[PDB]
């Protein structure tokens with residue numbers, strides 16, 4: 001996992017659960033309690049997993065539920081740290097831009113396995129967005145979507161269409177419906 005995003009998660013964990021839980025979780029995998037993780041680093045996925053399991057044990061919340069809560073709150077953290085990804089956008093543009101963003105942020109790592117987040121319109125007021133990744137981070141993905149809605153103040157209805165592993169990759173497809181129409185038919 002690129003350090004760019006792991007750094008945001010550590011802050012978000014502090015925001016949600018507090019410094020003791022976070023400091024102890026970091027110390028439990030051999031990190032300095034105050035470690036600041038940089039874009040220059042590649043963090044092992046299994047370490048992130050151990051940290052979250054320790055956060056789980058101390059809070060007494062299921063780890064899926066923690067990823068869900070982190071997903072929702074991390075949008076806030078992202079918009080404070082990298083506002084230019086948010087400014088002058090509405091929800092629909094932000095979400096459709098996300099696949100491209102994750103390729104751009106990992107393209108100079110080789111062996112990079114960004115999550116794929118391809119979205120397409122399926123109706124005047126709806127898109128289908130599909131999470132595809134080896135990392136099975138389904139609750140994070142869903143949480144991020146819920147936090148994006150809340151950050152842009154745009155109500156959405158989200159339907160999980162399908163979730164499972166297709167040939168090695170975890171996949172989760174959702175249909176996201178906006179309150180009003182956001183697309184219109186145009187000459188292709």
Ligand code: HEM
Nearest residue numbers: 001002004005078085105113114115133135137140141144
């Ligand atoms: C400005 C907003 C965002 C930035 C800068 C950002 C950046 C990143 C980066 C750099 C990674 C590490 C990927 C890797 O190492 O392969 C990551 C992981 C991830 N990103 Fe984002 N992200 C943003 C918002 C979102 C949104 C809105 C979604 C979903 C709709 C999303 C979905 C994910 C997921 C689910 C992961 C976990 C990795 C996985 O499942 O394979 N991100 N993000």
